[PDB]
Amino acid sequence: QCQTMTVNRQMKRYNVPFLTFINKLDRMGSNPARALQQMRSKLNHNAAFMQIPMGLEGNFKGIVDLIEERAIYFD
Amino acid sequence: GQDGVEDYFTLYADVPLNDMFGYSTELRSCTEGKGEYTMEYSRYQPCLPSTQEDVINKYLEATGQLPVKKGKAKN
Amino acid sequence: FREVVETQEGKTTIIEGRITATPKESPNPPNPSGQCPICRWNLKHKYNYDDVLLLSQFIRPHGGMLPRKITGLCQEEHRKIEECVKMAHRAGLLPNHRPRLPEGVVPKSKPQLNRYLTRWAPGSVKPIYKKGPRWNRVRMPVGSPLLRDNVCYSRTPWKLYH
Amino acid sequence: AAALARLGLRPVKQVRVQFCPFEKNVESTRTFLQTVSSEKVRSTNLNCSVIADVRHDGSEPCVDVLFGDGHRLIMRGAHLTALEMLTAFASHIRAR
Amino acid sequence: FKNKTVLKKRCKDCYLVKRRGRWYVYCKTHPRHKQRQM
Amino acid sequence: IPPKPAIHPSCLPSPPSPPQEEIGLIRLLRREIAAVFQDNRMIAVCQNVALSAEDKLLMRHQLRKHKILMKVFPNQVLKPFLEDSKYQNLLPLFVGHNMLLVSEEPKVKEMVRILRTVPFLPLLGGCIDDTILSRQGFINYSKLPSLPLVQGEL
Amino acid sequence: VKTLLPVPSFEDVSIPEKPKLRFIERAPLVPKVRREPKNLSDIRGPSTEATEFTEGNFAILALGGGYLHWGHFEMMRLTINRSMDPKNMFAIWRVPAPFKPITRKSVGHRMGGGKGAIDHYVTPVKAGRLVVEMGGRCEFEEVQGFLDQVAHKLPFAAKAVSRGTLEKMRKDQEERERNNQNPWTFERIATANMLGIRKVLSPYDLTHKGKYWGKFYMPKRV
Amino acid sequence: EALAGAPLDNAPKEYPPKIQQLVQDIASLTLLEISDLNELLKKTL
Amino acid sequence: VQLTTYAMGVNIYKEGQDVPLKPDAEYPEWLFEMNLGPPKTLEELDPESREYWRRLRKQNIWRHNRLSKNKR
Amino acid sequence: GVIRAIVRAGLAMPGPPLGPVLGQRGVSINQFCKEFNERTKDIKEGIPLPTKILVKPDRTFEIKIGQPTVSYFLKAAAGIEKGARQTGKEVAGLVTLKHVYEIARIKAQDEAFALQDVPLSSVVRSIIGSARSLGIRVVKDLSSEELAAFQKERAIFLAAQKEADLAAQEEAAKK
RNA sequence: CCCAUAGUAGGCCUAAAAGCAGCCACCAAUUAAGAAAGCGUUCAAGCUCAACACCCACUACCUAAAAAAUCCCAAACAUAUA
Ligand SMILES: [Mg+2]
Ligand SMILES: [Zn+2]
Ligand SMILES: [Zn+2]
Incomplete structure (x- = not known):
């Protein structure tokens, strides 16, 4: 949105590396692919993928790292 | 007039200061965040008769509020 | 006449168009100089709403009607048949001319209230509670305004508002 | 024939018409081909195409259509009009 | 709906209908043109 | 009290309507039709496609590049000319929207090869020097050899 | 194909100076010091003067009696000036300025003490009198439209007619009045005094022939 | 005088009679008339 | 500030020498048979020409446009 | 599209x-x-x-x-930079038949005319109508006549532009 | 019931008003369409209508109704002959 675009402009004009984290994944409106496509097209960033969900809305249980091929089962 | 760049445009406006009470709020609400504006002093122009009557009534209420208005509203 | 025939065989719908037979007019008209089917048989202002045979020759088996370019009626005669056919489906006449429906005739709500000379729809008119004073009383309409030029035998005009 | 354009014509694969010029019962298929090859109904999708086959000794105005579900619909307009086959094709392409 | 004695079409998509004893002017493009016969 | 007639006017046979006098537009149409039918020998009636004017001018420019023309006429002014003259066997081919081609000298190969690029441009046929033919007739006539060798083979 | 009729050429109708309507004032240039009574015979019956046309071909035909004050004239002239073409249309007033005085007393006063003071002024208008006349180089649809628009606003009944329309309406009126089935005409009974009807009628009905009553006009009385 | 019935070529069953008459007229001789035909054909072309 | 103002300084001879102007002999004769000032009416064209019917059609279109101004 | x-x-x-x-x-x-x-x-x-x-x-x-437009070519052939608000009572300039003929024969190669059987008479009639609707005027082929026409038109158009600017300034002053 | 390309941003204060801010003339091409007949337009896009192409019902008797306080009031029948 607007504030995200302004913070992105500042961080890109002063060159600050960062990583994206997605929060609140326990509602009936989870879609990381749409947000990633927005970051690709609407902004001037690069594509990436580090975690895979196993169920949304009311089925969030854990995440994967897809770097060591070993998911995490939070308890 | 109106300018413009690659992504958006740049409007050249000419609005008096009397009609600048809550222009930022509606300008933002009608632009979805990514809209800004700058204001600077220009010149002077003749006043509209509605605002003329408004400022006349205001000066009358400030000086003596009992020539007709509140003089008849109370008696 | 013409009908449509659709058949299913091997996921291939075969929609055909077979033309069947149909009767024609009698080869002896009383008034061949007439321009309308009603006028050629001297039925000008001689029919009523009880004639189920005359009304069944200008309508559709599913309750519809036919235009003027197909039948042959004029402007004032086509409206009389259109009004008389509406007075028949409400009075229980023409039981075979009911509209097609899947399975909606399950809950029989209001019972078969017998009626005749019905001009307007039942479930639409408003009940008259005031009825006016006396001189300007609001009477209930009956009959049809286009059926006033018919032949009478009672030495009195057709009272449509009483 | 704007209903066919407002509905849609994407799942269809290939359609074609066959009739004879010298016959007197080929106006229905002719106006059907004219309406199906308009501007909106043709520009609403680019993954389909039509075939205009004209024969002399055909003696039959058959129109065979089929969509992406592997089905097949052939309608011979020997006695049917244009609106009938139009609404039939519309219902068949909307229901499936 | 608005009570109007003399009904008329305010644009193009307005179509006249006869329902429940009154003439109504329905419109899908401009819903502001809904009129009711009194 | 209005006068009540004994016979209603809608029941008696109405007198015939007076025939209107023919205007000059239809006269000029028939004249130019006869003109283009006497001088030109090759015509091809094809169903007019209800396409956009952009592709229409595109195909017009593609046709006229080979030194040919195009002109159509309404059926109301064409059916009498087709039923009173010698082309009495072409009246069932003008019952709807169609386009007539006026091209001087026989050049059926190039026009067929340039119209077959679109699979939505059918044609009912036409006459080739007082010889009525169809679409398949045209596509098998375009494969005939050159005129000089056919003239000299005898 | 369809025929193409030639459009009616407008070359014999030249627009004069001042195509818009003139200004109508309230009181005249000289006030009337003598108070006149409210003579009701100036609007009862058919009109005598200002009946036929003069310059234009379109005019509003009145079908009833009534009075028009300054506000009505102002509304009419404003509507004409705002709904016309100054380069193609022009109108000329047919009724004179209002001059009939009307005396009004004070609000909440006893009955007596003579007549009141003169306030406004009106003008008498009978039935069949042309209110305003407008011509130009236009046709018949638009002028009839914006003339009926004003005629519907008038107190009395009025319609927008022309020359051919007035001729046709007079022709059908005389056709209906000369082809009567029942042989009992109102004029024959009123003039010959049948069944002693002259006791409840009026001497003015001999010339009106039952076509007028007070100020209205029934065109279906025959 | 109108035109012909407009046949087709996909089903060879009928042929114009004038061609048959011309062929029957020109195909019933030896070689002198063939030489005369060649002479009258090469006179122009 | 941008504007297409390329008015060449033509006096009395710069309009025939700057461009390859051809004399009147090389130009065909049928190029001067066109109209000049006023256009063409209806009583100047014979009823056996397309121009008269086109003018009549244009007049009919103008009449229809002037008529359909108040109706909806 | x-x-x-x-x-x-x-x-x-x-x-x-x-x-x-x-x-x-x-x-x-x-x-x-x-x-x-x-x-x-x-x-x-x-x-x-x-x-x-x-x-x-x-x-x-x-x-x-x-191909470019026609108004630019007409203004370049006439010599004036801006069009006039009136036609007949205030002519902007004069253009001979040779200039409009050259403009037509140059423009008759675009995507609108080269794809249609249009002759030279049609395009010269169209350009004459466009020149009449613009504000200028055509003429046979006037060598010395158009020379004198330009000689007088320079002065009369300068005077017309001066008086029009004066009228515009007066209208701007009455404000 | 269908149907819409182009010479152009036709001429001008306002930055421009490109078909709806004002002036006299409101041109012009193929069959046929208005330098604009009705909505949404600072300046452009979106929709119809008139005009071909196409069939071709009436394409329209013009407009003329209303709700106060104890509770609305006799009932009924368009069809055995003035
Ligand atoms: Mg447009
Ligand atoms: Zn609406
Ligand atoms: Zn009849």
């Missing part, structure tokens, strides 16, 4: 008209302007010409270069 746009050759800055429409369409604007500039650099005069573009569903635009 297609988008009608008439911009200047050597002056095609990304924004005015050709901006919001190109942004909402889904195609680029800077690349289009750069391509138009590199295509129009061949013109050594910067003549404004119309542009017919087409966009395909896969987001890709094409440019088809045609």
Whole structure:
């Protein structure tokens, strides 16, 4: 949105590396692919993928790292 | 007039200061965040008769509020 | 006449168009100089709403009607048949001319209230509670305004508002 | 024939018409081909195409259509009009 | 709906209908043109 | 009290309507039709496609590049000319929207090869020097050899 | 194909100076010091003067009696000036300025003490009198439209007619009045005094022939 | 005088009679008339 | 500030020498048979020409446009 | 579909008209302007010409270069830079038949005339009608006649422009 | 019931008004369409209508109704002959 675009402009004009984290994944409106496509097209960033969900809305249980091929089962 | 760049445009406006009470709020609400504006002093122009009557009534209420208005509203 | 025939065989719908037979007019008209089917048989202002045979020759088996370019009626005669056919489906006449429906005739709500000379729809008119004073009383309409030029035998005009 | 354009014509694969010029019962298929090859109904999708086959000794105005579900619909307009086959094709392409 | 004695079409998509004893002017493009016969 | 007639006017046979006098537009149409039918020998009636004017001018420019023309006429002014003259066997081919081609000298190969690029441009046929033919007739006539060798083979 | 009729050429109708309507004032240039009574015979019956046309071909035909004050004239002239073409249309007033005085007393006063003071002024208008006349180089649809628009606003009944329309309406009126089935005409009974009807009628009905009553006009009385 | 019935070529069953008459007229001789035909054909072309 | 103002300084001879102007002999004769000032009416064209019917059609279109101004 | 746009050759800055429409369409604007500039650099005069573009569903635009307008050619042949507000009572200039004939024979190679069987009579009638609707006037072929016509028209048009500017200043002063 | 390309951003203060802010003339091409007949437009896009192409029902008797306080009031029948 607007504030995200302004913070992105500042961080890109002063060159600050960062990583994206997605929060609140326990509602009936989870879609990381749409947000990633927005970051690709609407902004001037690069594509990436580090975690895979196993169920949304009311089925969030854990995440994967897809770097060591070993998911995490939070308890 | 109106300018413009690659992504958006740049409007050249000419609005008096009397009609600048809550222009930022509606300008933002009608632009979805990514809209800004700058204001600077220009010149002077003749006043509209509605605002003329408004400022006349205001000066009358400030000086003596009992020539007709509140003089008849109370008696 | 013409009908449509659709058949299913091997996921291939075969929609055909077979033309069947149909009767024609009698080869002896009383008034061949007439321009309308009603006028050629001297039925000008001689029919009523009880004639189920005359009304069944200008309508559709599913309750519809036919235009003027197909039948042959004029402007004032086509409206009389259109009004008389509406007075028949409400009075229980023409039981075979009911509209097609899947399975909606399950809950029989209001019972078969017998009626005749019905001009307007039942479930639409408003009940008259005031009825006016006396001189300007609001009477209930009956009959049809286009059926006033018919032949009478009672030495009195057709009272449509009483 | 704007209903066919407002509905849609994407799942269809290939359609074609066959009739004879010298016959007197080929106006229905002719106006059907004219309406199906308009501007909106043709520009609403680019993954389909039509075939205009004209024969002399055909003696039959058959129109065979089929969509992406592997089905097949052939309608011979020997006695049917244009609106009938139009609404039939519309219902068949909307229901499936 | 608005009570109007003399009904008329305010644009193009307005179509006249006869329902429940009154003439109504329905419109899908401009819903502001809904009129009711009194 | 209005006068009540004994016979209603809608029941008696109405007198015939007076025939209107023919205007000059239809006269000029028939004249130019006869003109283009006497001088030109090759015509091809094809169903007019209800396409956009952009592709229409595109195909017009593609046709006229080979030194040919195009002109159509309404059926109301064409059916009498087709039923009173010698082309009495072409009246069932003008019952709807169609386009007539006026091209001087026989050049059926190039026009067929340039119209077959679109699979939505059918044609009912036409006459080739007082010889009525169809679409398949045209596509098998375009494969005939050159005129000089056919003239000299005898 | 369809025929193409030639459009009616407008070359014999030249627009004069001042195509818009003139200004109508309230009181005249000289006030009337003598108070006149409210003579009701100036609007009862058919009109005598200002009946036929003069310059234009379109005019509003009145079908009833009534009075028009300054506000009505102002509304009419404003509507004409705002709904016309100054380069193609022009109108000329047919009724004179209002001059009939009307005396009004004070609000909440006893009955007596003579007549009141003169306030406004009106003008008498009978039935069949042309209110305003407008011509130009236009046709018949638009002028009839914006003339009926004003005629519907008038107190009395009025319609927008022309020359051919007035001729046709007079022709059908005389056709209906000369082809009567029942042989009992109102004029024959009123003039010959049948069944002693002259006791409840009026001497003015001999010339009106039952076509007028007070100020209205029934065109279906025959 | 109108035109012909407009046949087709996909089903060879009928042929114009004038061609048959011309062929029957020109195909019933030896070689002198063939030489005369060649002479009258090469006179122009 | 941008504007297409390329008015060449033509006096009395710069309009025939700057461009390859051809004399009147090389130009065909049928190029001067066109109209000049006023256009063409209806009583100047014979009823056996397309121009008269086109003018009549244009007049009919103008009449229809002037008529359909108040109706909806 | 297609988008009608008439911009200047050597002056095609990304924004005015050709901006919001190109942004909402889904195609680029800077690349289009750069391509138009590199295509129009061949013109050594910067003549404004119309542009017919087409966009395909896969987001890709094409440019088809045609012939310029007629008003610019008429103003260049007459010599005046701005048109007049009246016709007949205030003529802007005079143009001989040779100039309009050359303009027609040069323009009769665009995508609108080369794809239609149109002769020279039709195009010269069209350009004569356009000149009459503009504010100028045509004439047979007047050598010395058009020379004297220009000699007097320079002065009368200078006087007309002076009086029009004076009237405009008066109307601007009455404010 | 269907149907719409182009000479152009026709001429001008306002930055421009490109078919709806004002002036006299309101041109002109193929069959056929108005330098604009009705909505949404600072300047452009979106929709119809008149005009071809196409069939071709009436394509329209013009407009003329209303709700106060104890509770609305006799009932009924369009069809055995003035
Ligand atoms: Mg447009
Ligand atoms: Zn609406
Ligand atoms: Zn009859």
